[PDB]
Structure formats: structure tokens, C-alpha cells
């Protein structure tokens, strides 16, 4: 009944289209939730999409000025993958930060809400409020914004608390049926760790995070699900994935330390490893969240100083808006497949012809077959939609 | 299969956020039922929210003047906890008063409707109309407006009939698979008993009610689920929980009798006991239903003249509107947890910029871990919503 992710990793030559929600296009006619920060997670049967909704629909007076991220009204919305966030959507907890697991028996939700100084994480398992934690650093407590990973019933959640540009306390929480059985403080070479995309690299969990303080390469957190031992490093490829980042001609990585290049802010993203090569995805524009491309860097998990791509794909076009992206793993018949989702953000603070901010999602999965080209933007026309 | 609530009570140091429906905020855009008097109840798998809907949506011509409580059109609406009362909501009985149990096998609904003089209470079990009762006092027959409690298949419902300010006949009905097997008249020191919040204090049921006639402390009804013997008293803590109430410095309780202080009206609320201490919740404003705070009074279940709070929480801010609140118990892995819900009322008779009255719900559950601070109001802006 429990899920242990024991199978090997599927052979990946690229990613094929899997899903699209068309949320903003449907919001022009119809009642659709205003969301942001989505992700995808699958129980052993099918896949579900999650988002953080702002407590209102888009054709709503309350949709005005929804660019904030921490309000008492944001909740965690869950549907099946494909069903748009209509008014029948079940909102499963109060949260302005969230993460979700399925251990093979029941769903686990980690939900953060509250004052920026105090902040509480409620751990909800099987429809019960099983546990709760308070901020340790008395700052904005926050978590992965994507799926967490369970192996043998022990699920792991990475939670950060502290300054965005400075030393912050990051912890890894080991949860069993909603109860927190252990908590390990982060240790290693990664200085700033946020919004991690974790995947089961049996026998453990590997997370690729964002460095929001001093690096444009991504941190790596290796969690031993068993000994509860944490290792930290940086993604070693010379083609770094955070945005803002420097141009490919002049970008660098350290494989241990932040590169100290255009590391002021960042975006949530993903990466995983195929032998020595690294499969990664990033925005096409190096400074704005415009476009989205995935590719493979040869000897990129093992060598800084490698800038050799292969199997490049353009999931969203250079001039079309993207945002947070993340990884989730799907148990196949003989191996474990890796899929990713891209959040396509539309609205205020970058397009001033509307008063709202919302997102759509586009989902791709790895394939051992062949694939073509394309581009799957959001597609909404905001010049005609209601303000 | 039956539910017997045999486990101990969970260790409670406070309550953590569990759910929020954002009904009024979504009602501005979208079709949402106009409701009031909600509650929450859980079958052994998940939790459901119930409400008494006025037979109309909010963006409706029939939404005008919905402040009445007894109309031929109010029905009992049931969704999963989290799903807002959209137009796909199943309305499970005709009722302007209601209560609901789950005995581990099927749902029980007690639904009161009809004329104020001759009223009818239908008892519906497993989708059948199993039983029915008429008013005994030929007055407004009414019930708990929250969940009832079943132990070994025998469920218990507290029903009052008679004058709101005077001697009213209160009875406790013992139901088995929808059939009323016994009926005990209330006996003890509690004079007026209404809108009880009951919880399984194995081996029996303990209900904390409202005194709408002569007290601002809450009555207590101890039902022996087995011998069908009823005991009545009052909540003994010096910090009384009803509203209207006197200020903390000048409040009193009797442990046996109404205190005769600001006892004219009241509000439905809850309280339970942790050893000698009492965990309770009340509105922050002592006269209006504004705000909501929960805390613990030390030796408050055994000693009057005790005004020693601890573990205070502010669930709804002092400047925001609240209403009915109630308790419901959730069976955990090793103990029984206590949760409460608060009804956030918005609209006419207190905010004259709209013609309707509705409510939103916020749900908290007890926790043995730590928690922070916050405030979770309804958030609707009625200056911009349709009248």
C-alpha cells in the first residue's frame, strides 16, 4: 500500500505534451478561481493539480489587486489534472504557502498561513489536522510550493524561514502519517535554499531549489530518507537555470558555491540528472520570465565548465509569459518517469491592462519515443478581457 | 462499523487553521447559495460542511430580505469541507432547524420545518425518512444547529420547544437507525437550554448550550448514552462565554445556576474540559458578535471565581464580524481531537449597504504542536458587491 519508488528511472530523450488547463481563456466567460503558484502531484491512479487561490474568481470585484502573496484568504485548491478551477473546486486548507504528498495511502498537505512574524504550518493527513509547527526564525515561513516525496510512509518537506537575502534557517521535516517524527537542520554548501523541486532518487530524495540571495545556479539538497542526513551543493552545469542570470556566453557555476552572478532574485525551477548529464528547464529570456525551454547539458551534473546542450525543446515561445516551474515523478510499469509543469502568469505588474494577476499551467512528461516541435502559450487576450 | 468514540481525548495546547470557504467573496462573481447557521461533521473518512440555505443564491432577486429564519424554503445543504455552496450542492431535507450525525454506517439528519405552532421534525437515516415528531409545547420546535453524537449506533439529539424567555420543554431523543427509541425530559439545574454543542465524552455525551433567558454562562447537559440519564449544570468558569455578557472584571458564574448578568439574549457557542481547566471560545466584543477568541481558563470547569486565562488565540479580529460557533470531534489515530467552526455573518440588520444576509465559515482544530498568530476574517467588501 505504501509507495517506495523502488523502480529505476525511465529513459528520457525529451518531453511530450501532457496537459493544459486554459484557465485564463475560460475566465473571460465563466467563473474561474484566481490562482497562482500551482503544481501537480499524482496518487497511484491519476494526477491532480494544486494551486493557491486568492479567495476570489476572476470576473469579480475582489479580483482587483491580487498581486500580493500573503493574505488571510488564500487557500489550497485541488482538482484532477485537466479540470479547470471552477466554483466546484475543493479548497483543502488555509494556506499562502503549500506542499503536497501522496504516500500510497492518503494525501498529505503542508499549509502555511498567519502573520509574517508568527506563521503556522498545519500538517493535514487523510482529512485530519495531525500536526502543527510555528515559525522558528520569526519570519516568513515558507515551503516548496510543489510536491513533497514519501518513501516507505516517511514523507519529507523542505521549509525555509528567515531573510530572503541573508542567512535563513532551512529545515527538512520527516513526517509519518501527518505526524512530524524528525527535523534536520540544513547542512552543506548551499547558502540560500527556497522553493525546492524534489523528486525520489531512490534511496533518497533529491531537491533542486532556488538561490534567491547570491547565485544564479541552483542549489541541490540530497536527503537520505533513512539516516535523515542532508547534503548540499549546487547544480554543476555551466548553463545556469535561475532568472535573472547572465548570458550563456558568460555564465559560470561552482558546483559547490554560489557563482555570484546576477543572483539577486530568482524563479522556482527544476533539474534532474541522467547519469552525468543534467536535464534542466529555464526561461528563454535571461532577465524576465518570458518563454520556457528545456534541454540536456552533457556532463552537466558532474562538471562546471560544460556548456554543451542537446535535445532542446521550446515549451513556451520567447515572447510568451511563463513563471514558476517544477518537477513531479510518475511511477510507470518498469521505471520512474519525470514530468514538469510550467506556470504561465498573466496580469498586473507586467501587463497593466488588467487589475488582476492569475496563472494557467502547462504539463509535459518525459518520453523514450520521438517528439516534434511546438509552442503552448497561455493564449488569453487581455485587451478584450474584463479589467 | 459502528462508531463508539472509545479513545481518549487528544492533548490540546491550542488550535490550528483547518479550513475556510470564502463564500461571500466568491458570491460577488458566481452563483453561491445564501446560507446561515452552518456546522461541520465528519464521517470516518472526511469532513462535511452543512448549512441552512434560504432557497436562493446571493446574486438573486430572492436574496432580498433574507434575515428571517423560518420560511418554507430553507433547506439543509451538505458539501465536503472546503467546497463552496455552489449550485451543484445537494440539499438533503426541508428544514429551518437542523442537526446531523454519522454513526459509522450512515448519515442521520434531524430536520425541523413547518408552522411555528405545529412544527414537524423528520428523522432521515441512510436516505430514508425513518421517523417524525410533532411539537410538544406547540411553539417553535428547534434543535442544536450543530452535529449530534452517536455511540454504538445510538445517537442523541437535544430539542427544545417553548418560550425563549421562560420555561421551555427540552428533551433528549435517543435514535437508533433513524427510529426514536427513547425520549428523556431534561432534568437538572439548567433552566433554559438552546442550540447545544455536543461532543462525545466517552462514555457519554457532553453538551454546552446557550442560556437565552437569564444567564450569560453556558449550560451543560451530561447525557448518559446508556442509562439515558440526564444531568444539568452551568459552565463554572468566571469568564463567561455568552454574548451579551458583562466585562471580564465584573462577570460571575454559579456552577449551578444562571448568574443573572446580561442574560437577555445570547449566541451559540462551545466549550469543553481538559481535566479541571476549560477550553472555550467567545466573541471578542462583549455586546456585539464582533471578533472571536479562544482560550483556556485554569480550573474553570470546577471553580467559579477563576479568571486565569492561558493559550489565548485570536481567530477573528476584534473589528470583524463573527456569529454562531460550534464544536465537532474527529477520531484520530490514538485519541479524539476537538475542532470548532466559526460562522462569519455578513449583511443586513448590521450592515445596511446590502439587502441580504449570508455567512462564511472558518474551521480550526486542536493541536499538540505549536502555532502562531493570525486573523482570518470573511474579507468580503460589501461596498462593491451587488445589493
Amino acid at each position, epitope marked *: 500500500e505504501y509507495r517506495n519508488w523502488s523502480k529505476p528511472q525511465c529513459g528520457i530523450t525529451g518531453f511530450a505534451p501532457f496537459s493544459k488547463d486554459n484557465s485564463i481563456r475560460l475566465s473571460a466567460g465563466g467563473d474561474i478561481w484566481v490562482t497562482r503558484e500551482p503544481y501537480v502531484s499524482c496518487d497511484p491512479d491519476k494526477c491532480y493539480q494544486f494551486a493557491l487561490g486568492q479567495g476570489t474568481t476572476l470576473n469579480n470585484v475582489h479580483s482587483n489587486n491580487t498581486v500580493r502573496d500573503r493574505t488571510p484568504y488564500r487557500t489550497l485548491l485541488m482538482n484532477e489534472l485537466g479540470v479547470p478551477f471552477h466554483l466546484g473546486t475543493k479548497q483543502v486548507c488555509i494556506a499562502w504557502s503549500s506542499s503536497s504528498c501522496h504516500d500510497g495511502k492518503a494525501w498529505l498537505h503542508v499549509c502555511i498561513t498567519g502573520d509574517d512574524k508568527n506563521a503556522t504550518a498545519s500538517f493535514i493527513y487523510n482529512g485530519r489536522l495531525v500536526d502543527s509547527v510555528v515559525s522558528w526564525s520569526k519570519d516568513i515561513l515558507r515551503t516548496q510550493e510543489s510536491e513533497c516525496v514519501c518513501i516507505n510512509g516517511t514523507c519529507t518537506v523542505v521549509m525555509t524561514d528567515g531573510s530572503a537575502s541573508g542567512k535563513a534557517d532551512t529545515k527538512i521535516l520527516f513526517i509519518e502519517e501527518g505526524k512530524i517524527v524528525h527535523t534536520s537542520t540544513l547542512s552543506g554548501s548551499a547558502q540560500h535554499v527556497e522553493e525546492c523541486s524534489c523528486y525520489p532518487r531512490y534511496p533518497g530524495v533529491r531537491c533542486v531549489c532556488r538561490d534567491n540571495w547570491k547565485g544564479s545556479n541552483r542549489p541541490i539538497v540530497d536527503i537520505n530518507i533513512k539516516d535523515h542526513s542532508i547534503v548540499s551543493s549546487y547544480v554543476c552545469s555551466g548553463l545556469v537555470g535561475d532568472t535573472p542570470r547572465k548570458n550563456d556566453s558568460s555564465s559560470s557555476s561552482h558546483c559547490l558555491d554560489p557563482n555570484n552572478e546576477e543572483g539577486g*532574485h530568482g524563479v522556482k525551477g527544476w533539474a534532474f540528472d541522467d547519469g552525468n548529464d543534467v536535464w534542466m528547464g529555464r526561461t528563454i529570456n535571461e532577465t524576465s520570465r518570458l518563454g520556457y525551454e528545456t534541454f540536456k547539458v552533457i556532463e552537466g551534473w558532474s562538471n562546471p565548465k560544460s556548456k554543451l546542450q542537446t535535445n532542446r525543446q521550446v515549451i513556451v515561445d520567447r515572447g510568451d509569459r511563463s513563471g514558476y516551474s517544477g518537477i513531479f515523478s510518475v511511477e510507470g510499469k518498469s521505471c520512474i518517469n519525470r514530468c514538469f509543469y510550467v506556470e504561465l502568469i498573466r496580469g498586473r505588474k507586467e501587463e497593466t491592462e488588467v487589475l488582476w494577476t492569475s496563472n494557467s499551467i502547462v504539463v509535459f512528461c518525459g518520453t523514450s519515443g520521438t517528439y516534434g516541435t511546438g509552442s503552448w502559450p497561455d493564449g488569453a487576450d487581455l485587451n478584450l478581457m474584463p479589467i | 462499523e459502528y462508531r463508539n468514540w472509545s479513545k481518549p481525548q487528544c492533548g490540546i495546547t491550542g488550535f490550528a487553521p483547518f479550513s475556510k470557504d470564502n463564500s461571500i467573496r466568491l458570491s460577488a462573481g458566481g452563483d453561491i447559495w445564501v446560507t446561515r447557521e452552518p456546522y461541520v461533521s465528519c464521517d470516518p473518512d472526511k469532513c462535511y460542511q452543512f448549512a441552512l440555505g434560504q432557497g436562493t443564491t446571493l446574486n438573486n432577486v430572492h436574496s432580498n430580505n433574507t434575515v428571517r429564519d423560518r420560511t418554507p424554503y430553507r433547506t439543509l445543504l451538505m458539501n465536503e469541507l472546503g467546497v463552496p455552496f455552489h449550485l451543484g450542492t445537494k440539499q438533503v431535507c426541508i428544514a429551518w432547524s437542523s442537526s446531523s450525525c454519522h454513526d459509522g454506517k450512515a448519515w442521520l439528519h434531524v430536520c425541523i420545518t413547518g408552522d411555528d405552532k405545529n412544527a414537524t421534525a423528520s428523522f432521515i437515516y441512510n436516505g430514508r425518512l425513518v421517523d417524525s415528531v410533532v411539537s410538544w409545547s406547540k411553539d417553535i420546535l428547534r434543535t442544536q444547529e450543530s452535529e449530534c453524537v452517536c455511540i454504538n449506533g445510538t445517537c442523541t439529539v437535544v430539542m427544545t420547544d417553548g418560550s425563549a424567555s421562560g420555561k421551555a420543554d427540552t428533551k433528549i431523543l435517543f435514535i437508533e437507525e433513524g427510529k426514536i427509541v427513547h425520549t428523556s425530559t431534561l432534568s437538572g439545574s439548567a433552566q433554559h437550554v438552546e442550540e447545544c454543542s455536543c461532543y462525545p465524552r466517552y462514555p457519554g455525551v457532553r453538551c454546552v448550550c446557550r442560556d437565552n433567558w437569564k444567564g450569560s454562562n453556558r449550560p451543560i447537559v451530561d447525557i448518559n448514552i446508556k442509562d439515558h440519564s440526564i444531568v444539568s449544570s452551568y459552565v463554572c468558569s468566571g469568564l463567561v462565554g455568552d454574548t451579551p455578557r458583562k466585562n471580564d472584571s465584573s462577570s460571575s458564574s454559579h456552577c449551578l445556576d444562571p448568574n443573572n448578568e446580561e442574560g437577555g439574549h445570547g449566541v451559540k457557542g462551545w466549550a469543553f474540559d481538559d481535566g479541571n481547566d476549560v477550553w472555550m471560545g467567545r466573541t471578542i466584543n462583549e455586546t456585539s458578535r464582533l471578533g472571536y477568541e479562544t482560550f483556556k481558563v485554569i480550573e474553570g470547569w470546577s471553580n467559579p471565581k477563576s479568571k486565569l486565562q492561558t493559550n489565548r488565540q485570536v481567530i477573528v479580529d476584534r473589528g470583524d464580524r463573527s456569529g454562531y460557533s460550534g464544536i465537532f470531534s474527529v477520531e484520530g489515530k490514538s485519541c479524539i481531537n476537538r475542532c470548532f467552526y466559526v460562522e462569519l455573518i455578513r449583511g443586513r440588520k448590521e450592515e445596511t449597504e446590502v439587502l441580504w444576509t449570508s455567512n462564511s465559515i472558518v474551521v480550526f482544530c486542536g493541536t499538540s504542536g505549536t502555532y502562531g498568530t493570525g486573523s482570518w476574517p470573511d474579507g468580503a467588501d460589501l461596498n462593491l458587491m451587488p445589493i
Partner: antibody, heavy 123, light 107 residues
Framework: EVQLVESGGGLVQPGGSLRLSCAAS????????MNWVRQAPGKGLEWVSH????????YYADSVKGRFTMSRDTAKNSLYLQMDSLTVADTAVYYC????????????????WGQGTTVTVSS | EVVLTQSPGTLSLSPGERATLSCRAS???????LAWYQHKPGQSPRLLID???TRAIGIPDRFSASGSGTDFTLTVSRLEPEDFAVYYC????????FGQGTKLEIK
């Protein structure tokens, strides 16, 4: 409607103390960064101090540093400026303003402003 | 340590022309923590531009802004009678600093 109302502006002889208060309606200080900004008569805007939503005073202007104390009450939603040893250069119109720190994008910018209170140090 | 010198002081023009205001910065700064405010006298400051390129909520379409590093520019493309005021450029990242302003007066 959100509003900020500053109060406490008055004549102060040099060497004195005045406490300015800014009462906020429609939002909570537990999620917003609050600022004191002053305009001396005939000069431009000057950023006096800044406090986080987590309650830390992030910055005090060099002139005001050591003489002014900025605090907040998150129960009454009030912001306070205790000005000590007021000099004649501190005569100005004072303004409480509000901005935001977003987890994703970062600091935003002062979008809500008060009416203003004038503090004149004289003679 | 970053001093924001608004370049034109007391620019004067007539309704319906294009006005270009400039904020030059001593040292280079993150081009997303600079903002532009309007302070009509007797009224509280109002935020026009944020992140050096983003129009605020409610601001007319006349105002636009641009810039990078040490250079910043604002332009009201077609002036209006009530768009005559003082304009400040602010750096709300570390180090915090305002500008001295630019006065627009009807000729």
C-alpha cells in the same frame, strides 16, 4: 476603505519631544512595511524611517538616527514616532506610508499615504 | 552612496506636449527597485511608476517609464492641466534614497 491618519503635529520648542501617531484602517500592520517620510518646507521628500511587517526597524535616516524612535502597536494598528531633541531643521510635514515585501518579487513601493501632520520646531 | 540626481529642475511646458524627466544614479543599481511619485501641493504623494517600468493601479496611460542601471526616464506623452506637479524618483532598495524633484508649471 484603507486609510492612514497621522496625528500629533504641533509646535515644539527646540530640545523637545513630540510623538506622532499614524492610525491605519482597512489593513493589518502584520503584513505591510510601514514608513515615516518627511518634507521640510522648501525641500524635497526625505525618507525618515522604515519598519518591517515582522517588526524590525530596517532603517533610520542619518540625521534622525539616535534621536527618533519608531515603533508600532499591532493590536490597535498604530505607528508611532517618538522624536527627541527636536532641532529647527526637523520642522516638516510628516507622512506615514505603506509598502510590501513579496516573497517572489520583493519590495514593491509606497502605494498608500496619509494626510500628513506638520511638526514645527521654533525659536 | 547612490545619489539620485533628477536632471531637469523646473521644466516648463504647455498642455498637450511630451515631457521627459530624468533620474540619473551615481552608481549602478538594480533596475527593479526604482519608483516615480507625483506630489501635487496640498495633496499626499501618489505613486506613478514602480519597478522603473510598471504603471501603478489607477494611473492614466499618459505616464510611461524606462531605464537601466544609472539612467532612468519618465514621459507623460500628452500633458493635461492637472498633470503639473513635482516628480520624485526613489530608490527603495539598499541604500534607501529619494530624489530632489522636478517642478512642472503651466507656461
Amino acid at each position: 476603505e484603507v486609510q492612514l491618519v497621522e496625528s500629533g503635529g504641533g509646535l515644539v520648542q527646540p530640545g523637545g519631544s513630540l510623538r506622532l501617531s499614524c492610525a491605519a484602517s482597512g489593513f493589518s500592520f502584520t503584513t505591510y512595511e510601514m514608513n515615516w517620510v518627511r518634507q521640510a518646507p522648501g525641500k524635497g521628500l526625505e525618507w525618515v524611517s522604515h519598519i518591517s511587517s515582522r517588526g524590525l526597524v530596517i532603517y533610520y535616516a542619518d540625521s534622525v538616527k539616535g534621536r527618533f524612535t519608531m515603533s508600532r502597536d499591532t493590536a490597535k494598528n498604530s505607528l508611532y514616532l517618538q522624536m527627541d531633541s527636536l532641532t529647527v531643521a526637523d520642522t516638516a510635514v510628516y507622512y506615514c506610508a505603506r509598502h510590501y515585501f513579496d516573497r517572489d518579487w520583493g519590495y514593491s513601493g509606497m502605494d498608500l499615504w496619509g494626510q500628513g501632520t506638520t511638526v514645527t520646531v521654533s525659536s | 552612496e547612490v545619489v539620485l540626481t533628477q536632471s531637469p529642475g523646473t521644466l516648463s511646458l504647455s498642455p498637450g506636449e511630451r515631457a521627459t524627466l530624468s533620474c540619473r544614479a551615481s552608481q549602478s543599481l538594480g533596475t527593479n527597485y526604482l519608483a516615480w511619485y507625483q506630489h501635487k501641493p496640498g495633496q499626499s504623494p501618489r505613486l506613478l511608476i514602480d519597478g522603473a517600468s510598471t504603471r501603478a493601479i489607477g494611473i492614466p496611460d499618459r505616464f510611461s517609464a524606462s531605464g537601466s542601471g544609472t539612467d532612468f526616464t519618465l514621459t507623460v506623452s500628452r500633458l493635461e492641466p492637472e498633470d503639473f506637479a513635482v516628480y520624485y524618483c526613489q530608490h527603495y532598495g539598499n541604500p534607501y534614497t529619494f530624489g530632489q524633484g522636478t517642478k512642472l508649471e503651466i507656461k
